[PDB]
Design a binder for this molecule. Structure first.
Ligand code: HEM
Ligand SMILES: *[C@@H]1O[C@H](CO)[C@@H](O[C@@H]2O[C@H](CO)[C@@H](O)[C@H](O)[C@H]2NC(C)=O)[C@H](O)[C@H]1NC(C)=O
Ligand SMILES: *[C@@H]1O[C@H](CO)[C@@H](O)[C@H](O)[C@@H]1O
Ligand SMILES: O=C(NO)c1ccccc1O
Ligand SMILES: [Ca+2]
Ligand SMILES: [Ca+2]
Length: 336
């Protein structure tokens, strides 16, 4: 409909400023449209920002949090002191400056930077992007972010309160396919959670189901489990969700199709992006988001492992026929 100053066509004039913050983020924050640590950090930030939302706290007369309101930036002084929020300061400051510089709300900017960062990573779906979230927020209540040492019941209850079913919790975890850890075991900084930390694929679901065989570092860190090969980190909550009867069959269904995984993740992320808001009050600017390059590799059980090495945990459906790789056990380099 509209033609923005830069000659791009868009659906609504409110979308035009987003082509300028697209260019700045690609050039600066993402260092030339790369899929490296800034994208992984933004993905952890969108989750920590949107999940500070609790209907139970509201019901009990308390402030339950505003959801996807950008409070992790506006109130970074209080939220970054939460233990779930370590390692985020530098990224929050960079985002703060872009927000102030372009005059966009912090809640909208975090949703936008997530859709743009994912477009830099092969295999990613185009995420929906809505604009209009109010820039005003209150600090998130503490203790609303799931931790790696929590039990599956604990995570499902917390997530359930925020609004997600057990299935959507599994769908949301596709983001650990572009992930590493830096603070659980600092001795193996940026150790990846799957073998392709730069490709949005099914490898994370396959690899967390393999038998934990290897200790990747000198000792075990906080909530660390044995992993399937050198260089890969496995955290307890992911190991447990892959195997718990409440989530095991959805986890297994996510292993053979990058197309089904991406559709499911896109839907759960659209839901998460409007926690605390009425999406009917927001303007759709999804056409601003570029396409990612496609991932053409098929799912594989890496380095010589076979089906016999995966701990099948869904009792009702057989494990999918996934390709095996004819090689020695990989050793993963740190995520870039
Ligand atoms: C079920 C709850 C979840 C738990 C308990 C959890 C926990 C963690 C932990 C402990 C780390 C390591 C951080 C570090 O030490 O550097 C991590 C990393 C990450 N998580 Fe999650 N996570 C969960 C859900 C999600 C969701 C829903 C998303 C986003 C949609 C997400 C995206 C990421 C990303 C991209 C990283 C990698 C960050 C980096 O490489 O620097 N996580 N997660
Ligand atoms: C959104 O609200 C935040 C405050 O919560 C605004 O941030 C401040 O902006 C001024 C300049 O405009 C800076 O000098 C301050 O350092 C910022 N404070 C914080 C905590 O970031 C922000 O400008 C608001 N944005 C819009 C478009 O209204
Ligand atoms: C596998 O090899 C990588 C480097 O290729 C290491 O980072 C890892 O710890 C393991 O030795
Ligand atoms: O990122 C987290 N949850 O998403 C997290 C939670 C508790 C402790 C450390 C962490 O990194
Ligand atoms: Ca928030
Ligand atoms: Ca991956």
């Amino acid at each position: 409909s509209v033609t923005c100053p830069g000659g791009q066509s868009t659906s609504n004039s409110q979308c035009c400023v987003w082509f300028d913050v697209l260019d700045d983020l690609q050039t600066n924050f993402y260092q030339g449209s790369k899929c490296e640590s800034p994208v992984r950090k933004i993905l952890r930030i969108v989750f920590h920002d949107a999940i500070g939302f609790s209907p139970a706290l509201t019901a009990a007369g308390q402030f339950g949090g505003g959801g996807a309101d950008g409070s992790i930036i506006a109130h970074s002084n209080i939220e970054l002191a939460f233990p779930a929020n370590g390692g985020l300061t530098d990224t929050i400051e960079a985002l703060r400056a872009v927000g102030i510089n372009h005059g966009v709300s912090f809640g909208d900017l975090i949703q936008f930077a997530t859709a743009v960062g994912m477009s830099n990573c092969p295999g990613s779906p185009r995420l929906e992007f809505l604009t209009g979230r109010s820039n005003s927020s209150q600090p998130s209540p503490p203790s609303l972010i799931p931790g790696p040492g929590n039990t599956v019941t604990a995570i499902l209850d917390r997530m359930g309160d925020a609004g997600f079913s057990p299935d959507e919790v599994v769908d949301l975890l596709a983001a650990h396919s572009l992930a590493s850890q830096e603070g659980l075991n600092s001795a193996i900084f940026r150790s990846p959670l799957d073998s392709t930390p730069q490709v949005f694929d099914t490898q994370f679901y396959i690899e967390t189901l393999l038998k934990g065989t290897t200790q990747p570092g000198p000792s075990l860190g906080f909530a660390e489990e044995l992993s399937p090969f050198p260089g890969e980190f496995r955290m307890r909550s992911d190991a447990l969700l892959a195997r718990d009867s409440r989530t095991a069959c959805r986890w297994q269904s996510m292993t053979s199709s990058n197309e089904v995984m991406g559709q499911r993740y896109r839907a759960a992320m659209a839901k998460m992006s409007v926690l605390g808001f009425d999406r009917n009050a927001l303007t759709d600017c999804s056409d601003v988001i570029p396409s990612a390059v496609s991932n053409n590799a098929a799912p594989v059980i890496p380095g010589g492992l076979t089906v016999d090495d995966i701990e099948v945990s869904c009792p009702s459906e057989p494990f999918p026929e996934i390709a095996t790789a004819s090689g020695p056990l990989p050793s993963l380099a740190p995520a870039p």
